[PDB]
Amino acid sequence: AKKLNPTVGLWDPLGIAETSPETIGWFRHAEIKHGRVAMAAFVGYCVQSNGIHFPWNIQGWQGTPVVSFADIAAAGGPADQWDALSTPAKLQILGVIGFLEMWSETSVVLKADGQEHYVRGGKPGYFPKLSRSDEMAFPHPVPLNLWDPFGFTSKMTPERKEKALLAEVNNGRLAMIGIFGMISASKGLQVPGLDTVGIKPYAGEVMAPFAAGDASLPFVSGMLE
Amino acid sequence: SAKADLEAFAKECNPVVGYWDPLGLADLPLWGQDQDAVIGWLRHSEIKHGRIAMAGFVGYIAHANGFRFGGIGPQNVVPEGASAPEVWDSIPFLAKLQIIGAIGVLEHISEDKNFLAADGMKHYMRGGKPGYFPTFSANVHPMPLNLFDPFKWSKNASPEKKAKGLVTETNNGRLAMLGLFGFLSESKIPGSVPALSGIIPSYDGDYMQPFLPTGPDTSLWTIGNLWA
Amino acid sequence: KAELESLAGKLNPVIGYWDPLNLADYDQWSQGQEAAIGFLRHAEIKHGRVAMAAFVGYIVQSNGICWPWALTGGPNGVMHSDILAAGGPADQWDALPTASKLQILLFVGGLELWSENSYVLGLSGEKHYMRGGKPGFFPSIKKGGIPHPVPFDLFDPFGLSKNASPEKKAKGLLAEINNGRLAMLGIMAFVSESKVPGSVPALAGKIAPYSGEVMAPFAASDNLPFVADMLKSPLF
Ligand code: CLA
Ligand code: CLA
Numbered sequence: 001a002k003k004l005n006p007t008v009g010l011w012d013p014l015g016i017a018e019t020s021p022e023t024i025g026w027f028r029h030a031e032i033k034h035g036r037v038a039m040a041a042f043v044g045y046c047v048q049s050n051g052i053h054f055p056w057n058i059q060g061w062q063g064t065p066v067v068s069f070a071d072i073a074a075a076g077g078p079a080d081q082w083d084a085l086s087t088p089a090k091l092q093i094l095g096v097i098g099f100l101e102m103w104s105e106t107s108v109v110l111k112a113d114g115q116e117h118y119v120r121g122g123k124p125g126y127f128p129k130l131s132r133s134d135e136m137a138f139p140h141p142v143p144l145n146l147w148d149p150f151g152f153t154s155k156m157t158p159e160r161k162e163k164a165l166l167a168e169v170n171n172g173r174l175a176m177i178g179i180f181g182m183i184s185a186s187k188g189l190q191v192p193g194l195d196t197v198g199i200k201p202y203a204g205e206v207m208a209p210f211a212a213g214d215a216s217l218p219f220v221s222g223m224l225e
Numbered sequence: 226s227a228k229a230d231l232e233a234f235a236k237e238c239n240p241v242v243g244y245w246d247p248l249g250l251a252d253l254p255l256w257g258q259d260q261d262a263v264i265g266w267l268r269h270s271e272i273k274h275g276r277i278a279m280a281g282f283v284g285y286i287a288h289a290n291g292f293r294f295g296g297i298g299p300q301n302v303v304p305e306g307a308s309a310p311e312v313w314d315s316i317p318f319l320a321k322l323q324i325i326g327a328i329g330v331l332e333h334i335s336e337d338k339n340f341l342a343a344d345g346m347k348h349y350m351r352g353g354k355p356g357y358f359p360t361f362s363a364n365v366h367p368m369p370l371n372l373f374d375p376f377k378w379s380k381n382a383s384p385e386k387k388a389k390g391l392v393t394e395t396n397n398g399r400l401a402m403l404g405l406f407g408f409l410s411e412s413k414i415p416g417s418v419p420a421l422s423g424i425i426p427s428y429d430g431d432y433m434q435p436f437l438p439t440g441p442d443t444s445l446w447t448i449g450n451l452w453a
Numbered sequence: 454k455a456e457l458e459s460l461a462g463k464l465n466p467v468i469g470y471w472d473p474l475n476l477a478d479y480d481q482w483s484q485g486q487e488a489a490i491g492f493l494r495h496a497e498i499k500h501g502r503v504a505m506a507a508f509v510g511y512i513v514q515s516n517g518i519c520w521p522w523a524l525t526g527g528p529n530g531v532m533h534s535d536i537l538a539a540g541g542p543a544d545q546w547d548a549l550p551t552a553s554k555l556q557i558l559l560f561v562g563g564l565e566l567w568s569e570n571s572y573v574l575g576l577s578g579e580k581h582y583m584r585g586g587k588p589g590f591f592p593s594i595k596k597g598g599i600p601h602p603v604p605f606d607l608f609d610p611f612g613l614s615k616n617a618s619p620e621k622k623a624k625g626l627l628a629e630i631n632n633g634r635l636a637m638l639g640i641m642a643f644v645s646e647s648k649v650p651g652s653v654p655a656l657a658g659k660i661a662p663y664s665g666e667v668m669a670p671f672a673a674s675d676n677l678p679f680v681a682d683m684l685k686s687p688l689f
């Protein structure tokens with residue numbers, strides 16, 4: 001992608017461009033992944049701030065105790081919702097995300113799918129398909145998938161695919177601006193805060209507080225921030 | 226061949242500075258031992274100093290922050306937060322002795338001609354590569370994994386990549402020597418390094434005496450502790 | 454060997470031969486390299502079998518299940534459920550009088566001695582697992598000796614594995630290796646949950662405390678020599 005918008009061009013003040021091809025592929029992969037994660041996080045934050053608490057948490061859904069999903073949802077914004085879940089829940093969610101990331105980085109599965117060098121190198125952003133042959137052979141047939149589980153993208157031309165990829169890159173850049181702006185607006189800051197937007201965590205980057213084994217860290221008070 | 230290699234390595238280390246030898250130690254026969262052995266000794270000692278300084282800088286950060294292993298071991302005697310000069314002040318005396326002994330064992334293995342000639346190498350003064358460590362393959366009882374590459378993920382490296390790695394190692398070693406003695410100098414005299422003023426507390430004991438302020442004599446070994 | 458590459462691929466086609474330590478090159482016994490891979494394979498298979506046995510034993514001993522037999526020795530002794538009344542399945546081993554643990558350990562030792570014997574292994578047709586041969590193979594208790602006839606052999610006592618498909622036997626060996634690794638993880642998770650309460654996401658508040666050592670077979674009640682002198686200092 002040379003330039004989606006002709007009026008901008010190649011805005012590379014840091015000089016990271018014109019580098020090794022593996023470095024450029026890793027940079028493009030990081031940009032696409034950060035944009036997709038930011039868009040998903042912004043959508044989830046908007047849904048949580050509006051209030052979409054599910055009718056769930058029955059039959060021992062908290063580890064013999066039964067704490068309602070609305071009780072976890074009655075803490076404020078998404079930042080307070082990420083600090084009210086139990087340690088096993090956050091740990092298993094992070095484990096599922098890590099399993100998906102490791103399956104995406106898998107060069108054996110990518111080469112079976114007909115791709116290029118892994119760690120999201122050639123054709124970055126391509127999630128490997130968890131189906132068919134030589135993958136997930138031990139039960140777990142995976143009737144769904146990651147990309148297009150319902151097959152809405154069954155047929156698409158290469159030019160249409162490239163245009164959709166460029167649109168996804170532009171929307172990912174806009175979402176990387178927007179989700180960070182929303183988190184900053186939660187933490188005071190930004191421009192036109194408004195909209196209540198509750199309170200904010202210590203930094204949002206604390207991850208899993210109130211855990212056991214390595215969570216005895218009173219260091220989240222300072223370090224400027 | 227000796228000074229020419231020395232010029233080439235100095236040029237690769239820094240194209241601007243190049244060969245900088247104001248003292249001319251690369252012309253002094255250190256033991257009446259020609260030129261090749263003298264530059265081999267000098268390069269080996271520079272590389273060893275740089276590696277030890279890089280490890281010491283990382284360890285100084287780890288001890289100054291407070292990064293203990295866990296239980297039972299020598300970390301249990303060290304108080305929780307004493308700054309890095311004082312963590313080699315509270316470990317037991319035999320722990321210091323055995324640490325220095327294991328370092329000497331590693332140096333002796335790195336110098337023993339049986340280990341060097343096992344994997345086809347000679348002494349750095351006698352014509353070997355300076356800073357090289359022979360793997361383990363002479364030590365009577367077998368050793369599980371080597372010291373340079375423990376998991377052997379660097380076996381596919383090109384010779385050009387290895388040369389650039391050596392140049393980066395030497396530059397990082399020099400800069401880490403400078404940083405580590407910035408720390409040690411600020412721990413002794415105030416106002417030497419202006420950036421580190423007020424971060425590192427002052428220390429009274431001697432840094433160049435290993436067993437000065439020697440640690441206690443405690444037995445941390447349980448189960449069958451016949452050495453009470 | 455280098456055949457263990459293909460065996461690791463057959464165990465899991467995604468992750469092949471996985472050895473960061475490169476322990477197949479480690480010649481720990483200073484024999485041939487073939488002997489080293491043979492020892493490692495036999496150790497893995499034996500560890501796995503012991504782990505599945507211990508896992509099922511832990512599961513069926515952790516919830517109020519005990520045999521209605523006696524284990525008394527004559528008008529007095531354990532009622533065979535007083536060991537169940539000692540706590541979870543780690544105080545139960547430390548409550549089996551004195552001679553019970555001795556006879557169990559000696560039975561396992563004689564079984565391993567029968568495993569290792571080249572005259573017994575060679576009479577079945579195989580060899581020792583490092584001197585070629587097949588790893589994990591238990592020789593017949595009938596053909597090798599034992600002058601009084603015994604009813605069954607250890608492997609397949611009732612005979613419900615005879616004339617099986619050889620590829621089915623290879624698939625069973627691979628499944629044995631995989632389930633052995635999984636069972637080792639399970640049984641060490643349980644043993645960690647005995648002593649350490651804060652470990653693992655699951656299993657919270659479901660495991661007995663067992664203020665003792667899991668790795669100490671003989672307990673403080675044994676009247677063997679030393680033992681009490683050997684238990685005069687605990688650890689972590
Ligand atoms: C003990 C550590 C040590 C050792 C053995 C070497 C060894 C070497 N260096 Mg070297 N170097 C070091 C640390 C060291 N360096 C540090 C910390 C820096 C960064 C400042 C450099 C920067 C450097 C450059 C830029 C170059 C070398 C080069 C060389 C090689 C030839 C020069 C020579 O004869 O030695 C160097 C001289 C000595 C080691 C003198 C010994 C120290 C004296 C006796 C004590 C002085 C103490 C005193 C307080 C210092 C005051 C500092 C200040 C007031 C001036 C030789 C292999 C040349 C090269 O690249 O060849 C490959 C070269 O061009 N060095
Ligand atoms: C017993 C352990 C031991 C041994 C045998 C060696 C051996 C060696 N080291 Mg070495 N080293 C060690 C530990 C050891 N190291 C430790 C723990 C460190 C810190 C991490 C280093 C850091 C180090 C560096 C940085 C360098 C070496 C180098 C060397 C080599 C040459 C040293 C030399 O000629 O100096 C000989 C030194 C002495 C004879 C002095 C020894 C100290 C004496 C015994 C102290 C006693 C004095 C005291 C007053 C007595 C008290 C009692 C009295 C009152 C009666 C040699 C292979 C050099 C090298 O390889 O360059 C090519 C080099 O540059 N070493």
Ligand code: CLA
Nearest residue numbers: 457460461469470471472476477493494496497500634637
């Ligand atoms: C002690 C039991 C044991 C033994 C003897 C073996 C033996 C073997 N394994 Mg193996 N394995 C084990 C347990 C064991 N495994 C477990 C529990 C798992 C699941 C996590 C696996 C998963 C596994 C895979 C995926 C593969 C092997 C392979 C192999 C073979 C060659 C590699 C090798 O030598 O590694 C031997 C490793 C050890 C002996 C472990 C060392 C134990 C140390 C000394 C103790 C402390 C370390 C610590 C507990 C381990 C790290 C914890 C980790 C969870 C973070 C060899 C036959 C390869 C193969 O199939 O080739 C035939 C292969 O690709 N293993």
Ligand SMILES: CCCCCC(=O)OC\C(C=C=C1C(C)(C)C[C@H](OC(C)=O)C[C@@]1(C)O)=C/C=C/C(C)=C/C=C/C=C(C)/C=C/C=C(\C)C(=O)C[C@@]12O[C@]1(C)C[C@@H](O)CC2(C)C
Nearest residue numbers: 273276277280296297298299324328331332445446447448
């Ligand atoms: C039972 C088997 C295990 C026993 C272990 C043991 O007994 O103790 C173990 C123990 C404590 C303990 C115990 C427990 C384990 C906690 C529990 C037990 O509890 C019981 C049973 O009761 C016993 C107990 C209390 O002891 C602590 C161990 C500590 C350890 C092992 C500390 C290493 C420092 C390395 C340093 C400082 C590096 C220096 C730096 C070095 C070496 C170099 O720079 C080398 C190098 O420069 C050279 C020379 C040349 C260069 O070219 C290359 C480089 C640059 C590389």
Ligand code: A1ECV
Nearest residue numbers: 059060061062063064086088089090091092093094096097
């Ligand atoms: C494959 C099936 C499966 C099993 C067998 C388990 C194990 C397990 C048990 C036994 C409980 C209940 C224990 C109890 O209450 O007794 C439990 C729970 C949670 N889990 Mg894990 N888990 C995920 C993370 C998560 C969260 C948020 C919670 C809970 O809130 C709840 C919980 O523990 O509450 C404190 C995700 C999301 C990415 C997915 C998934 O399918 O997405 C792809 C799964 C799937 C599985 N989980 N998980």
Ligand SMILES: CC(=O)O[C@H]1CC(C)(C)C(=C=C/C(C)=C/C=C/C(C)=C/C=C/C=C(C)/C=C/C=C(\C)C(=O)C[C@@]23O[C@]2(C)C[C@@H](O)CC3(C)C)[C@](C)(O)C1
Nearest residue numbers: 279282283379390397400401403404407408418419420421
């Ligand atoms: C007065 C003033 O204001 O100035 C201040 C400035 C400043 C900066 C604040 C100060 C300071 C402190 C300083 C200068 C600190 C310097 C510290 C330094 C320079 C520390 C090196 C570590 C190197 C390591 C650990 C090597 C790892 C090596 C590794 C991991 C490997 O070998 C692996 C690998 O290599 C292979 C084998 C081959 C390749 O595949 C590459 C890789 C990596 C995979 C001072 C003192 O206060 C002074």
Ligand SMILES: CC(=O)O[C@H]1CC(C)(C)C(=C=C/C(C)=C/C=C/C(C)=C/C=C/C=C(C)/C=C/C=C(\C)C(=O)C[C@@]23O[C@]2(C)C[C@@H](O)CC3(C)C)[C@](C)(O)C1
Nearest residue numbers: 505506508509614625632635636638639642653654655656
């Ligand atoms: C058709 C045919 O060939 O006939 C026969 C012939 C043949 C060959 C003789 C057969 C046989 C013999 C037998 C009887 C074989 C039996 C094998 C047996 C008994 C196998 C047990 C495994 C136990 C496991 C894996 C436990 C895992 C344990 C796990 C995974 C855990 O606990 C995980 C977990 O703890 C963690 C790690 C952390 C926690 O936070 C979470 C939890 C708690 C979940 C067969 C197979 O019957 C078939």
Ligand code: KC2
Nearest residue numbers: 276279280354355356357358373386387390391393394397
């Ligand atoms: C704690 C100690 C320590 C530190 C902090 C450290 C730092 C770095 C850095 C980062 C600054 C780089 C980039 C780097 C790279 C290389 N190291 Mg070092 N290294 C340390 C230890 C050793 C030992 C023991 C050996 C060794 C070697 C090599 C070779 C191989 C060259 C070749 O085979 O040509 C390369 C490329 C081996 C060698 O032979 O050096 C002559 C060898 O024996 N290194 N090393």
Ligand code: KC2
Nearest residue numbers: 502503505506587588589590591608622625626628629632
């Ligand atoms: C209590 C301990 C124990 C457990 C828990 C256990 C579990 C499983 C599982 C389930 C995960 C499977 C799938 C499985 C499969 C096979 N086992 Mg087990 N097995 C145990 C003990 C033994 C012994 C003692 C022997 C043995 C063998 C085989 C053979 C091959 C037979 C043949 O090819 O001759 C196959 C296919 C024999 C052998 O290894 O022969 C090379 C042999 O001697 N097994 N085994």
